[PDB]
Amino acid sequence: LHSEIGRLNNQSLLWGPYRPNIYFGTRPRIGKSLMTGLMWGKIESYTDFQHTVRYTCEQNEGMKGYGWDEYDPRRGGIQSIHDIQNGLDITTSFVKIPGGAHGGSWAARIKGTLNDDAPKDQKTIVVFYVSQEGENSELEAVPSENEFGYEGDVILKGRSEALGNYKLVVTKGKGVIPQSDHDLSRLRGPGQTVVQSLTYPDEVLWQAKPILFQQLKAGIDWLVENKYDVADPPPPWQVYLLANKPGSGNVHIVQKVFEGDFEFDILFSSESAGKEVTSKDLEREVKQATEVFGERFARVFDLKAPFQGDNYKKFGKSMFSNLIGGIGYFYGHSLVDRSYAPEYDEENEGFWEDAAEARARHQEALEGPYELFTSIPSRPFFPRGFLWDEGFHLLPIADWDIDLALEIIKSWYNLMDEDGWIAREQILGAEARSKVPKEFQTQYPHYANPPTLFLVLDNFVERLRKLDETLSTASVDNPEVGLEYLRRLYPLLRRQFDWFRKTQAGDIKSYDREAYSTKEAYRWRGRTVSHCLTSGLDDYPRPQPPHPGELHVDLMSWVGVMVKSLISIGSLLGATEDVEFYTKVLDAIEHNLDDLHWSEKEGCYCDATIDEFEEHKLVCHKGYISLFPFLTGLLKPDSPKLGKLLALIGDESELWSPYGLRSLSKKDEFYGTAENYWRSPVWININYLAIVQLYNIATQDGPYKETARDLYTRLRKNIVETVYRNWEETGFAWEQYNPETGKGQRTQHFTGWTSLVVKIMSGHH
Template identity: 60%
Template sequence: MAGYGWDEYDVRHGGRQTIHDAGNSIDITTEFVKVPGGQHGGSWGVRIKGIPRDDAPARQFTTLVFYAGMEGFGSLKVSNEQDDLGIEGSVTMAGSSNELGDFTLEITEGPDSNKHPPPTHKSYADKPLDRTFVASLQASDDTMWQAKQLLFTSLKVEIDKMIAEYGAEQAPPPWQTFTIPNDIKEGNLHLVQKVFEGEFEFDVIYSSGSAPPVTSRVLTDAIETATELFTERFSNLLSPKAPFDKPKYQPFSKSMFSNLIGGIGYFYGDAVVDRSYASEYEEENEGFWQETAEARSRVGSIKLEGPSELFTSIPSRPFFPRGFLWDEGFHLIPIADWDMDLTLEIIRSWFNLMDEDGWIGREQILGQEARSKVPQEFQVQYPHYANPPTLFLIFESLIDKLESKSPLKATSDPLEFVRSAHLQDPPTAIAYLRTLYPLLKRHYFWFRKTQWGDIKSYDREAFSSKEAYRWRGRNPTHILTSGLDDYPRPQPPHPGELHVDLISWMGMMTRSMRRIATFISEPEDAREFEGYETAIIRNIDDLHWDSNEKTYCDATIDEYEESVHVCHKGYISIFPFLTGLLPADSPRLGAILDLIADEETLWSPFGLRSLSKADPNYGTKEDYWRSPIWMNINYLAVKALLDLAQAQGPHKARATRLYTELRKILVQNVFDNWERTGFAWEQYNAETGLGQRTQHFTGWTSLVVKIMRMPDLSKGEIRDEL
């Protein structure tokens, strides 16, 4: 692939997706739109177009297979009459279910300009390629998602027949051989195949029985409208600002955002959970990680729970098609600017997963299909494991927008009243937060109960004897629960550890809870959270600031049973700054900015690296969070620098310079990689800037869109829409 993904997309109207299939010398465009109407969610349509690439052969043959299946109760059948030679014209399926009512699904023949491979083999008489092939299958619910394998099985049967009849030496050409059988019958899964020569186009149209039928002409109009509405909305809300307000950045910015919002999906199924509550999972003994590993190996502690459902924005459609708790908060930062109602529905879906104790699984691997993409050792979720509470960043964004009282920009979108209902009418936002508030409190106090850190046992001096935190789920090489997987931590692991990134997240979470309680008029709760917040901020300095290293560090217990700092300079060193817990006049800020700006530590020509070049662990072993540049943490850094640049204080001028330069190099590097490879990447190499690990990673890497939208302080622009 030379690249693929949405060029423009909005979940409420639709958009355009392009697949640059270099291996098959074809560019395929799918234009998907929703057509509202009726009582069952309306109708939709997809227009599929193919254009041979410049290096395509003179006679380019392409085959496409569309399939539709009905899971659970309901019916789906091909309603066309099949003649001896195949299907004439369009293929129409008729279906019905409790959720969808009656509907039809039409796969059109397309315009007269479509061409098909001519007869070149005597097998053409039995399977003429100017007809559409349809094969009906009966699939169980647990195999329906394996439609690709079912297709290949069907193809192999036909290939074997061809070889048996004509012999390997006289076999038909590939475009004739690789075709499904014409076999229409009762079934719940129907494969539809077309074979084209050169350019092609056809439509797939779903018409709800409770709404007027959709035609190709209606689809054409809907596609034009969807493009117009997307262009207008993007220009108003997310169009890049200087120096990225040049034409070349527009397709890039639109694509990055469209793939982020186009990664929203609905997931349903059971999850693998270990609720044995073995004492070893308390992680309070030295050598606890060994006890934990032994406890995990016991038979019978792992069970399937659910089914559950989740509405979520995923990191990568092809590689990580499931919900990640800490990723979600970052995903929703740009989406909240685009569609607050959609954002809040996703958040509600996550909190509806919470158990009675307040736990939400950090990875939502729901059902067999989702588990097929995850190594077995990572599938089990543990109810004492946390993940950074980034969803609380979105609650603060909501309150910021409401408190700013900025007038909403006029739009011609007929669904604007839905998208912005919570912003236009504060009582609606208050009602939403009040409904969710008991779950938010339960989740917050679950964090305090399960991720607490030990101050008293080791005679640590701190403002508060309670505000300290430690990630559970630790072993000598990883803390997956922190999100910073292999970032170096104190060795060996110790139950007396304290983690500076976690206490910073807890400070942000507490601030958010205070603001929510204030906004919904819960003054007693607000005062309680304010007390926790003050204690956390004081304890960050008391427990984690190292005056010799001039940075924030994790703490552990040494062989003399004394508390000591372990300082691996990198992302965790600046977490109190990243989470907005340091005031503009903090005496720590000068050293923090020194660390950020130091080319031997965090600063690189392409963004802030995850670990200092001077650290002996730099670039070692897995090297996941031990050197690469990550967009989510860099976004937090850019935003924190912007906040500092726009506040009155001794570091205003320096913060402005660092913000301007960091914003520029981050955007330019992601853009250069996208232009060169056709993809966004999971992370970027700190030495070369090259994208690496997972390609088509359009989750938090899409935060580049938000960074491009930030003000250009080199021209004195005021704070706007942050």
């Protein structure tokens, strides 16, 4: 039955608009296969189209906003794009139609409406670009009847091992096609849909924009060569209409020019499914997916007071749709330094200089190929997998569709190497590398990131203990399915736990350090004078200078998270010996968090270091790090340490702002200094952990029940309202929020863990 559910999940999830790095395109979850993408741009002159055309996602003054209004990767969804530069409001509807043996069929409608500011006779070029990778596969445009291009539909017929036979149609569409009365029309036609079928080596087909422009440029070269000149030039839109030449190839460019509003469909029909997809099917399936989305949302994300109103529901649907709509499929090689230089051990004072020296040996090389199916922090800025971000992304996604979340977890763990390492940033293949400066591509096997994916597993385990609709929860509704899943995953979880302990160990025995356990101490590798990128809290202040004798309280807390998960999952699988080992480890961390990290004088937890005099010293910087044992759920509900942390949490002169908890205290010497990334601003992910833990204390008997209820109530409201107000005003989720003004700042379209807000509103943790 586990095999059966797996096969049905595979077929269900195979197709999607899984290219979030671009405004709109599709690909299946197969490395070398068929991929599509859309481009559009107004043309008002002979030189503007290169500057107006749109393809890869960005966010700047010429784009009002864009994103998914509704989305479910099993069914499809609807995206809206509001383009100021091109004067257009665009909708892309995508829908999936199950059937056959190759992951089913799909369709999309592309609709463009000029906004109020645009000239009513604006000319817009639209291109649908199709490529197919694979040694043996084939794809051919059926030639038109007409002399110069197509009066009606463009049909591509293709075949591959992965997809079997299929056809992909770009419909005639609706809207005015401009017509040229120029002499050129005798040789190029007066204006019509055109197709060019080309071939390039497979590894460059992703380069759609250069490939398109190389063809446009050759068309212009032809004009010049054939005496079309400035004494009597064709209109710009005709200069930029490709000469029709359909045929066979691994690239097909389908181009249309519209005057005023327009729309057209893309119909992909899997031959193994029988009857082909029509436009009427598209319209029916789009209607049905919306109805299903609405019903699931009201069940899964039932927003509680004071967020029950229609305005907050629309807000929630947007934040959620943008999060799950960010899911991509990525495939290719990644850049990794496999030297294991000894400098990377960081065992000496001044280690960051030695590690820099090793990095300058540039031993990294491409390896793989790897694949990844994952949600992402940001379409325009960070369109790829980030390890600790993904644990937060999956908490709302697991609510919606636990089977999908487990699929993504499995994808990530399938990257793990023989030692237990998963690179914290997954830049897979040339297309992915194209967005990233070369200096930032290389991944390092000694660099960790918080194991937040364990949080998602925790929720799954709790559900486990306590047709698309059926598949979405199959792994919990069938207990033996969920548990076979855990059985396969458990060894990888254990390997990663061992890896943290092997590679991120701190030093107790070499110094005058007294503690209950001589084993439990942790130090994040990879720190520089001003940063600790691997912790996730880039510029949060740490001991200065960095030192091989540092101990980081957040990392120790994350180890505690992992050991608790392993206790839960080990128990289910009957791993008796393992559980005894984990039990002793947890006891040890509970004691050592106190012995090595608790500051009585400051009333919170602190990182530690070793003095100029080789003595243990606490380094207290009150902020998120100070709260880590509470955030990760390691403190008992009656702990006096807890009570002091609640005082710090609620203190307006420290962490509490009207807009959420500040990352760093206003009273800290580093508040609002340098780049100020994690040195004051409000971050939704850590606020989310605080909210969930406050709620935990609030709904249990104990000394702090009432304090926690009060802080829970207010922090929920502060956080939700901050993200809501900014969204109302700007259309965006932001990376972080200003604690003085409440304004979203840093990057836009951060969905992204800011989307946790949907689950804070729905409550009932």
